[PDB]
Amino acid sequence: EIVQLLMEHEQTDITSRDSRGNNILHALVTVAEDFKTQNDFVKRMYDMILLRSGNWELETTRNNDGLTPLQLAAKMGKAEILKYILSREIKEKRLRSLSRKFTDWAYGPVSSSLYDLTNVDTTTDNSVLEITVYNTNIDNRHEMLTLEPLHTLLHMKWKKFAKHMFFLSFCFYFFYNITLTLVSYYRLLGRMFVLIWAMCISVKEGIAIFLLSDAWFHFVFFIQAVLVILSVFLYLFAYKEYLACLVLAMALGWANMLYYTRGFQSMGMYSVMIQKVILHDVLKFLFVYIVFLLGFGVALASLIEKCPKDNKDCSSYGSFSDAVLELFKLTIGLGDLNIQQNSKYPILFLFLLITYVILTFVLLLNMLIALMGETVENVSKESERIWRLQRARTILEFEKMLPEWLRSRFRMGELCKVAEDDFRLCLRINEVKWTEWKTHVSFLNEDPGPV
Amino acid sequence: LVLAMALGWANMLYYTRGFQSMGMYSVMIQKVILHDVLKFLFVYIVFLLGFGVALASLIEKCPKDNKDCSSYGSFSDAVLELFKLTIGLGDLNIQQNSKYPILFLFLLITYVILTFVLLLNMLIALMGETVENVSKES
Amino acid sequence: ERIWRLQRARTILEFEKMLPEWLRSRFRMGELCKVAEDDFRLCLRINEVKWTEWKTHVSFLNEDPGPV
Numbered sequence: 001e002i003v004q005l006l007m008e009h010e011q012t013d014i015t016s017r018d019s020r021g022n023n024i025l026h027a028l029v030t031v032a033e034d035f036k037t038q039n040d041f042v043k044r045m046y047d048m049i050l051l052r053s054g055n056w057e058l059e060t061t062r063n064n065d066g067l068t069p070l071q072l073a074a075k076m077g078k079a080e081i082l083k084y085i086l087s088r089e090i091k092e093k094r095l096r097s098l099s100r101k102f103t104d105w106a107y108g109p110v111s112s113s114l115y116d117l118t119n120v121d122t123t124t125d126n127s128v129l130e131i132t133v134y135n136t137n138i139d140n141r142h143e144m145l146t147l148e149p150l151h152t153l154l155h156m157k158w159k160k161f162a163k164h165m166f167f168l169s170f171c172f173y174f175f176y177n178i179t180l181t182l183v184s185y186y187r188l189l190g191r192m193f194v195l196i197w198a199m200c201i202s203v204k205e206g207i208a209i210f211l212l213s214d215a216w217f218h219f220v221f222f223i224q225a226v227l228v229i230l231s232v233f234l235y236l237f238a239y240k241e242y243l244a245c246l247v248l249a250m251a252l253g254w255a256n257m258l259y260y261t262r263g264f265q266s267m268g269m270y271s272v273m274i275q276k277v278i279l280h281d282v283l284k285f286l287f288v289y290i291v292f293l294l295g296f297g298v299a300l301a302s303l304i305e306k307c308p309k310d311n312k313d314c315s316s317y318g319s320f321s322d323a324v325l326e327l328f329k330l331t332i333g334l335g336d337l338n339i340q341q342n343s344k345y346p347i348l349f350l351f352l353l354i355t356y357v358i359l360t361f362v363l364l365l366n367m368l369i370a371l372m373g374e375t376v377e378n379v380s381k382e383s384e385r386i387w388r389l390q391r392a393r394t395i396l397e398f399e400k401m402l403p404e405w406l407r408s409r410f411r412m413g414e415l416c417k418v419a420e421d422d423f424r425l426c427l428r429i430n431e432v433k434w435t436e437w438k439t440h441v442s443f444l445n446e447d448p449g450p451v
Numbered sequence: 452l453v454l455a456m457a458l459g460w461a462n463m464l465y466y467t468r469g470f471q472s473m474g475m476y477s478v479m480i481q482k483v484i485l486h487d488v489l490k491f492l493f494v495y496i497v498f499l500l501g502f503g504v505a506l507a508s509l510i511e512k513c514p515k516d517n518k519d520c521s522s523y524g525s526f527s528d529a530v531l532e533l534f535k536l537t538i539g540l541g542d543l544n545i546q547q548n549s550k551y552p553i554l555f556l557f558l559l560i561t562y563v564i565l566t567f568v569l570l571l572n573m574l575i576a577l578m579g580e581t582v583e584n585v586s587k588e589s
Numbered sequence: 590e591r592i593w594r595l596q597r598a599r600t601i602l603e604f605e606k607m608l609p610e611w612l613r614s615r616f617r618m619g620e621l622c623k624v625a626e627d628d629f630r631l632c633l634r635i636n637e638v639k640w641t642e643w644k645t646h647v648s649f650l651n652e653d654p655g656p657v
Contacts, residue, residue: 038640185504185526244551247505251558254501261494270490273572282568325545325556332563333539371571375579 003045007052014053021064024049029073032081043084054095067126068119074131077138086115086149091442096419102426105448106440109432114444115149117413117425122399129153133393136214142385145392152429153412154392157399160410165398170260172197177253180228184246198228213276214390217259224252262390272383272390277374285367289360296356297323303349306342314341331360418444475589482588483577491573495566502562503529509555514548521548537566624650 006012017023022030025046032042050058059069067075073082090099102114120128132144145151179194202225208218227249234242261271301320308315317323317340329335330353343349399407416426464480467473506529514520523529523546535541536559543559545552605613622632 033640181501181504184508241550244509244554247508247558248554250505251501251561254497257497258494266486267490270572270576273576274569277575278568278572282571286564325543328560329543332536334536334541334543371575372578375575376582379575379579 003048007049014049015057015061017061017063021062023058023061023069025058025069026063026072029069029076029078029081032073032078035080040080043081046081046084050098051092051095054098056098070119070128071126071131074128074144075135077140077144079140079143082144083147086120086147089442093419093442096442097422102418102444103440103442104428104444105446106443107448109434109437110430111433111440112428112430112450113148114416115427115429117149117153117427120149121153121413121425122396122407130396133389133396141389145388148429149427152427154395157395157412158391160412162395162398166260166263166394170263173257173260177250177257180246180250180253184250187243195228195232198225198232201225202229213279214393216275217256220252220256220259224249224256227252262387268387268391269383272386273379276383276386277371277379281367281370281374285363289363292356292359292363293324293327296352297327299352300327300349303343303345304340306344308342316340327356330357475586478589479585482585487573487576490576491569495569498562498565498569499530499533502558503533505558506533506555509549509551510546512548512550517548520546522546533562536563622650 007014014024018027028042028046032038062068063072070082070085072078073085085100087101088099089101089103090096100116102116104112104114122129129150132138132141132150135141138144145154176194176197179190183191183194201221205218205222205225209215209222212218227245231242231246231249234245258271258274261267297317297320300317301323304315304317304323308318312318317326326335330337337353339346340349413425413427415423417423418426464477468477503526506523507526510521510523510529512521514524518524523532532541536543545556549555608616619631619633621629623629624632
């Protein structure tokens with residue numbers, strides 16, 4: 001009521017930017033915490049204020065940061081307000097311009113909604129899409145992407161070219177790794193292309209990391225390329241030994257191949273499960289297990305510190321590294337076990353060695369508990385939100401790798417006419433609604449024909 | 452003939468599908484082998500090749516005509532040793548017929564770790580859907 | 590999680606008991622505040638936010654909402 005009173009006065013200045021430069025709309029976007037908290041009233045005030053001023057000025061302006069209110073809601077973790085903005089259908093014939101969501105035709109429950117892509121597509125300097133995707137500050141990007149226009153843009157771009165580009169890069173990397181394997185196993189015409197590709201990806205990864213738990217793979221590729229260039233430079237020198245590092249990069253290369261399983265749906269979910277959760281858990285598991293290994297191997301080597309007496313087979317665990325290897329054998333089940341000689345207390349030796357096994361077993365059971373507990377519900381949704389998010393990030397990466405003229409050629413979206421003699425980009429999406437029935441007063445085209 | 456025998460005794464499982472308990476049993480077999488196991492097998496074959504090439508490369512050091520000295524000599528031999536290891540039958544030991552025991556051991560340990568983690572993720576992906584969808588779908 | 594929080598509180602109290610009087614006096618959490626009728630007592634501050642329950646705030650110690 002007070003807002004109505006204020007807007008009715010002619011002395012009022014709706015367009016007044018504060019010291020920070022923000023309009024009313026930027027401010028409201030700075031406040032939309034979530035639905036469970038507010039009960040979604042700020043959206044109502046946004047709508048009312050727009051309807052009080054039939055113009056584009058408020059949404060067009062920028063703050064001192066240089067961002068529209070839309071770009072601002074994308075910058076923050078603000079979804080409901082964005083869902084509203086990107087989907088506005090105003091029945092008022094006079095204020096039809098302000099709407100972004102348009103119904104081209106509604107013969108019945110089937111109808112083609114015509115969304116708008118003025119500052120949403122990647123054509124602008126900073127699109128809503130790049131803003132949503134290239135910020136890890138929010139931790140809500142999945143709820144941001146599931147919206148109609150952005151979701152459809154991403155999947156249509158994947159349908160057009162990005163699938164081809166990803167398969168292309170995967171084929172190149174597959175060829176590269178096959179060449180590396182052939183070179184290493186049997187150790188010139190192929191090695192040249194290998195080295196050139198290595199230097200290319202080295203420069204790429206270096207630049208990307210200079211620009212920089214998602215970017216780990218960049219460091220992985222960088223390490224692989226560094227190892228490859230190092231081994232190839234050392235090869236020129238008369239050093240047979242240096243070549244030993246080659247297989248290391250090869251092994252690392254195969255880890256990089258895991259990255260490309262991120263593409264397929266099932267394989268992608270499986271790969272994210274490989275990457276994140278298992279890292280988080282098994283890294284701590286491995287750290288504690290290694291400290292156990294050291295703490296027990298030192299003791300065992302100390303007990304068996306007794307002299308061998310011209311018998312090395314009697315000196316099992318004799319070397320500390322040898323003792324660690326023997327416990328590795330034991331936990332896996334490789335090492336022939338027996339009551340060790342050269343121990344003043346063989347019974348206590350065996351007791352400690354069995355306590356090792358019991359501790360390792362209960363430790364395995366602990367990690368199993370942690371994994372099965374996390375795997376219930378958090379893993380599914382988290383892995384989906386990570387997978388689709390990384391896919392969209394890489395889609396935009398491929399799109400940025402391109403030049404201007406090709407992008408122009410593609411031209412996602414169709415130019416279309418909106419009332420009041422306007423022409424703008426739009427996106428057509430066919431959708432059905434059985435629950436709601438109504439006379440479609442707001443329709444762009446009388447004839448529901450597709451063409 | 453013998454192959455058929457094997458396949459034949461894999462086919463009796465079919466008739467187990469009659470019983471309700473054995474019915475859900477066989478259907479769980481089918482669903483798991485279709486969904487989770489193929490991923491494990493494929494990517495594990497990938498790792499087998501990626502690591503066995505390197506193992507054979509290091510084992511390229513000639514044993515002077517002694518297959519026992521330079522274990523992991525043949526590529527298929529190294530893969531068989533890796534299989535025994537993942538089952539635990541092998542008799543591992545630092546091979547004097549090698550230029551680098553340190554790198555050999557580190558790579559073998561990383562292989563074992565990766566295999567264990569991959570098996571573990573197979574188990575996790577199983578448990579994830581285990582509770583809700585399995586019973587009803589079966 | 591319950592046992593974790595519980596044992597962490599136990600440890601915190603143990604370490605607090607390990608300290609001397611003067612360091613404890615230094616790390617005293619809370620602040621003196623005037624409540625009512627020449628009453629000065631210790632208090633703990635928590636800034637809270639509520640978007641649901643709307644009401645004209647009648648009862649308040651300080652007229653100016655400034656932190657200091």
